[PDB]
């Protein structure tokens, strides 16, 4: 919910710096990812409604124990709000931030063998919307810069024409590029249209609307932080600053 609310590149990377890896990993068993299932949608149909479960749903799924599953759990958390079930990763890796895993070699995780095409296909890039594809491409660029695979990232964009048009423009080592970026990455937000307490047909759409309706409740909740009215009560370390720089950028 909090990760889906971020609407700018600066906010997204700032959230990932303060968020540990354990938030990406889920400890609920879930179900196997790719299955043709029948779900109940009584608002629309009397018969059961066919659908296919996927990894970018908002509900936890079972994940492979390899490094591929860990990266695929991080991206699903960013684009869908929930991760997958990969237990016994370890204290050392789980305490690191999401940005450290994606960008830093000191974590101890080796990810240079990853194939962006296979990861995108397993994440069902075809079913993703524009904001979801932009968020995943941000994760790919950070991984490419960590492994020195910038050339491979560019070629993968050349093969996929729709991905090249929406590819965010920022150098993963320079903070000046992040501040200038004006891409809108928000998935949930205050809706200008009429939003009703109604169900959706597919699993992805229904789960997304739950976060959208939950965010509205979160926005008016006491947990939400109102910068306009309570800026002085925020701690100085985590207070918003114009000259905000990620470490090493």
């Amino acid at each position: 919910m909090d990760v889906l609310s971020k609407g700018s590149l600066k906010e997204l990377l700032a959230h990932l710096e303060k968020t540990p890896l354990e938030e990406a990993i889920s400890y609920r068993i879930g179900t196997v990812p790719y299955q043709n299932v029948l779900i109940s949608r009584n608002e629309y149909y009397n018969q059961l409604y066919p659908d296919t479960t996927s990894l970018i749903d908002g509900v936890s799924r079972e994940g492979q124990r390899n490094v591929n599953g860990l990266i695929m759990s991080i991206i699903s958390y960013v684009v869908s709000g929930s991760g997958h079930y990969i237990p016994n990763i370890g204290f050392m890796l789980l305490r690191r931030s999401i940005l450290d895993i994606l960008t830093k070699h000191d974590t101890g995780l080796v990810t240079n063998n990853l194939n962006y095409g296979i990861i995108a296909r397993n994440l069902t890039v075809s079913k993703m919307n524009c904001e979801q594809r932009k968020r995943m491409l941000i994760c790919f660029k950070l991984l490419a810069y960590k492994d020195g695979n910038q050339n491979d990232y560019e070629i993968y964009l050349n093969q996929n024409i729709p991905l090249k048009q929406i590819a965010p423009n920022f150098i993963p080592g320079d903070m000046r590029t992040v501040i200038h970026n004006q891409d809108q990455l928000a998935i949930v937000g205050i809706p200008a249209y009429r939003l009703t307490q109604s169900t959706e047909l597919s699993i992805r759409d229904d789960n997304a609307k739950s976060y959208k309706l939950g965010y509205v409740d979160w926005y008016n909740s006491n947990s939400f932080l109102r910068e306009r009215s309570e800026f002085n009560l925020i701690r100085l370390k985590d207070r918003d600053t114009k000259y905000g720089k990620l470490n090493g950028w």
Partner: protein, 298 residues
């Protein structure tokens, strides 16, 4: 044994899964509402001998006043409407329109993007299979009115099995000459010109006597839930406009003569109830495309 099937029911391509939420549904509804006013503004212009009713309608639709220099295109709403139409047809078509742009355009007018208020009747005749024995020829042709021509050159009468699926509600069969039809494991009645059948009843057996060919004309009626603003005349015209304008030219897609054939073919595919909702939204989008493009040709 030979098997004959309808040509338009073969291999329905997967439809898009984007722009089918509440926010995008209201965008299509707003476009349909505002495109209707664009057409109606032309009639009001004639009465007052002034272009100010058209300027008002165009400004709301396009967020900009029309100019005599350039051709009227419709602005951001037209670009968004064209792209969502492409995405609805095929899964391979990109979803390039941002959510924020859909968010802003859906706030122009007050509507509810509910696509299950009413129903519409679609007249495509689904013939999943016609099973015929050896030494008999069966030809199925047509979608709105299916003509099945059957000739047997064997010694005796042959039995032909008809399978109309499980989705269609009513099928009426009319023969050139009186014939006999009955369900599986039922007695065969006297020869009669017109049969009314329900496809859920089961496979149907037709006696084909040796001699002159027998032709059966089939008409079907299927009810599909659609929004109140649905107009089949405008949806059908929009389907032809989009096909001619190259909005459906994507790789590995099937092409259909009418929206009637398109919606029934996806209905009869495996897990076809998922496709019906998306195709209905595409129909409303095509209704807006027909009115917008007729007012502003490009």
């Amino acid at each position: 044994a030979n098997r004959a099937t309808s040509a338009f029911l073969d291999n329905p391509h997967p439809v898009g899964v984007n722009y089918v939420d509440e926010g995008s549904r209201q965008f299509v509804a707003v476009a349909e509402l505002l495109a209707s006013k664009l057409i109606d503004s032309s009639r009001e212009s004639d009465e007052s001998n002034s272009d100010v009713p058209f300027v008002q309608a165009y400004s709301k639709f396009a967020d900009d006043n029309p100019r005599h220099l350039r051709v009227k295109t419709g602005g951001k709403m037209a670009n968004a409407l064209t792209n969502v139409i492409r995405s609805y047809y095929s899964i391979n078509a990109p979803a390039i329109v941002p959510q924020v742009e859909i968010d802003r355009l859906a706030s122009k007018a007050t509507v509810s993007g509910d696509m299950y208020n009413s129903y519409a009747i679609f007249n495509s005749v689904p013939i999943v299979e016609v099973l015929s024995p050896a030494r008999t020829t069966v030809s199925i042709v047509g979608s709105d009115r299916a003509d099945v021509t059957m000739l047997n050159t064997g010694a005796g009468a042959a039995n032909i099995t008809f399978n109309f699926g499980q989705i269609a509600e009513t099928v009426i069969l009319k023969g050139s000459v009186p014939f006999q039809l009955a369900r599986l494991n039922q007695p065969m009645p006297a020869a009669r010109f017109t049969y009314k059948l329900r496809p859920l009843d089961g496979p149907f057996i037709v006696v084909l006597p040796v001699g002159n060919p027998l032709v059966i004309s089939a008409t079907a009626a299927t009810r599909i839930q659609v929004p109140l603003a649905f107009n089949k005349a405008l949806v059908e015209s929009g389907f032809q406009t989009a096909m001619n304008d190259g909005l459906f030219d994507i790789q590995n897609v099937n092409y259909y003569s009418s929206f009637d054939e398109f919606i029934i073919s996806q209905y009869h595919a495996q897990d076809g109830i998922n496709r019906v909702s998306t195709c209905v939204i595409l129909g409303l989008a095509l209704q807006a495309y027909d009115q917008m493009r007729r007012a502003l040709p490009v």
